[PDB]
């Protein structure tokens, strides 16, 4: 269980060690496909506690999702309902991004 | 300590080991017996007055035949069954969805002989 | 409140450009090694009427440096070129009408056309029938050059932006009256379907803002804002002034 140390390191996110790696990895991921198979888990400690045991069977998929709010579709910003249901920009979508991904 | 020497300005996929099939089992039970054999090709002759008129002059057999058949199968089947030399074979699909074939034999053979030999007259 | 004519025009259903008879892209040759080091020649095979563009085209043919073949390009023909005149291109080309030099290499007072906005965009400015630019001085440090566009307004652009020497052909196209509706129709049916144009003041209030009334009149002010949205815009857009002018212009 050297993983504990890793966990603590990850937990210090704003420190220059990690927000250095961040800036590399963020670039790296924004160059590949949106969904793609990761070869090996990036933060295996985290993976492990989510219930993953590195053997044949368990596959890791790196995926991105587009950020911020869900705009409602409704064409030329209309709605046709009573004033309460005229929201377009500010609505927010119940499930998290993690879910969509 | 050296590199490769690429002259064309682009990269391309390696024409790798195109490995052929070698499956641990057969796809189905056994090769399906001939779907369309000589008997399944030609079904029946045709006895209408027109047909007989053709037979007596033209040296022309007439047949109802299966739809999946074509002129090749027809010119095979006829030889295989009736021991003939066939010419030109001209087919239509009848109004009622049944393929009619007009099968002219070579001048060697007679139709009206092969007609009453097979049975119909 | 029906969606008005102008609003539909961007949707792109009927209004798209009619381009059966169009000859090809009126671009320059790709700015490569050869053209931006020394120079490179060609011959002009055809000069030809492109439909929906009063300026006649110029089909020129160079030898590709990097393979044995004849790759063809198609400039907008500059006035005074002839089939089988040579056309020299690039850095050390001569200042004769037809050639495509970088803007640093020309003097000032020089007339070019088809000039690129920036290096290697293959045609951009002065590409209309008759129009032309005038290079009116270098800015040799951070290699720009100051140029006179056919509107009147000025611009600062890279010296490495090529542009072809001379005016463009078909000048004084618009000098003739179009004369009868038919001719206008014929002109426009090879461009798109923005003709003829019904006046907004005629059509009913559902159709267009100006519309309706007992008399054919507007009623609200016609000059509308830059900040006004799609469908509000149906007048004189964000006009800094209006009505008939008086006096000499290019008002410096």
């Amino acid at each position: 269980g050297a993983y504990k140390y890793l966990e603590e390191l990850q937990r210090k996110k704003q420190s220059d060690v990690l927000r250095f790696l961040q800036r590399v990895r963020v670039w790296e991921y924004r160059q590949k496909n949106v969904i793609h198979r990761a070869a090996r888990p990036t933060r295996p400690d985290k993976a492990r506690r989510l219930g993953y045991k590195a053997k044949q069977g368990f596959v890791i998929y790196r995926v991105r999702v587009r950020r911020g709010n869900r705009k409602r579709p409704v064409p030329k910003g209309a709605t046709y309902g009573k004033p309460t249901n005229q929201g377009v920009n500010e609505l927010k979508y119940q499930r998290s991004l993690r879910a969509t991904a | 300590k050296a590199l490769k020497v690429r002259t064309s300005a682009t990269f391309r996929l390696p024409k790798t080991l195109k490995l052929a099939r070698a499956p641990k089992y057969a796809s189905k039970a056994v090769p399906h017996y001939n779907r369309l054999d000589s008997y399944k090709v030609i079904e029946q002759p045709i006895t209408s007055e027109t047909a007989m008129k053709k037979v007596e002059d033209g040296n022309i057999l007439v047949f109802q035949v299966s739809m999946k058949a074509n002129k090749y199968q027809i010119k095979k089947a006829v030889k295989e069954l009736y021991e003939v030399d066939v010419l030109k074979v001209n087919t239509l699909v009848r109004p009622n969805g049944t393929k009619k074939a007009y099968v002219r034999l070579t001048a060697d053979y007679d139709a009206l002989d092969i007609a009453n030999r097979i049975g119909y007259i | 409140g029906r969606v008005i004519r102008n609003q539909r025009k961007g949707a792109g259903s009927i209004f798209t450009s009619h381009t059966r008879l169009r000859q090809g892209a009126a671009k320059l040759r790709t700015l490569d090694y050869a053209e931006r080091h020394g120079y490179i020649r060609g011959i002009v095979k055809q000069i030809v009427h492109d439909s929906g563009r009063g300026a006649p085209l110029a089909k020129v043919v160079f030898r590709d440096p990097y393979k044995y073949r004849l790759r063809e390009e198609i400039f907008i023909a500059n006035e005074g070129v002839h089939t089988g005149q040579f056309i020299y291109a690039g850095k050390k080309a001569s200042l004769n009408v037809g050639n495509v030099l970088p803007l640093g290499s020309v003097p000032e007072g020089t007339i070019v056309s088809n000039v690129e906005e920036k290096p290697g965009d293959r045609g951009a400015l002065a590409r209309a029938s008759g129009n032309y630019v005038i290079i009116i001085g270098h800015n040799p440090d951070e290699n720009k050059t100051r140029v006179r566009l056919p509107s009147g307004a000025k611009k600062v652009i890279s010296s490495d932006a090529r542009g072809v020497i001379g005016v463009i052909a078909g000048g004084g196209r618009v000098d003739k009256p179009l004369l009868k509706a038919g001719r206008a129709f014929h002109k426009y049916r090879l461009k798109r379907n923005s003709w003829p144009k019904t006046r907004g003041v005629a059509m009913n209030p559902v159709d267009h803002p100006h519309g309706g009334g007992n008399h054919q009149h507007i009623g609200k002010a016609s000059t509308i804002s830059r900040g006004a949205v799609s469908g509000q815009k149906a007048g004189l857009i964000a006009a800094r002034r209006t009505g008939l002018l008086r006096g000499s212009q290019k008002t410096q």
């Binding site: 050297a2 140390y5 790696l21 590399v24 | 682009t10 | 440096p65 990097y66 044995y68």
Partner: protein, 233 residues
Amino acid sequence: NPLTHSTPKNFGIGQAVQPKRNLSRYVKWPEYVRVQRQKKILSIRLKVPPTIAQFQYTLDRNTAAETFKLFNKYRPETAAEKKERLTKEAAAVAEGKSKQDASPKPYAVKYGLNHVVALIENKKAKLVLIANDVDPIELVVFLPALCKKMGVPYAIVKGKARLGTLVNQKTSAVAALTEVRAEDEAALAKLVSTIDANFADKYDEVKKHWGGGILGNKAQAKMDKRAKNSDSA
């Protein structure tokens, strides 16, 4: 000398086909290639911290070679040898009747990353080697800190694959010596002194050093022609 005439080709921009050159410079490599090369380049360009860039400072091919001479003597077992030990113990459990004292004690390398940590925490580790790689650098980075803290020598060797090769897997990135046969014991001390001179005793200095901020060949040229030749020429 014969009738074979000489005819040189003028490759003078305009006339003659400019023929095949080696354009290994220009060619359009696949996306993955681009990703890895620019990942490298980017890592070099950025201002990288103290705690990273303690890596890339590595053990050199001579002293390292001596290291691989030392360690490689202590490879652990394979299938043949494990089977041999199984046969031995099978023989000795019946007749000798010694409770787990048929074969000797093994003196081959102790390893495993977690294992290595667990050794370091009780000072049971006497020497520890570390590869520069491990793409999730999360794993290895904090070892230097344990080693310097727990009075253990740490050697940033090159190639996690090399470390693998001695320990008979594909990869490893960590191999440590606790026990050792009192025979090649002088060279051990010699290493300890050498290693500690290279990496260990400079750890505080490393704590102040900032690697990265290293411009490319053409950027460097631009810096030189422009920024240097203002006062000088």
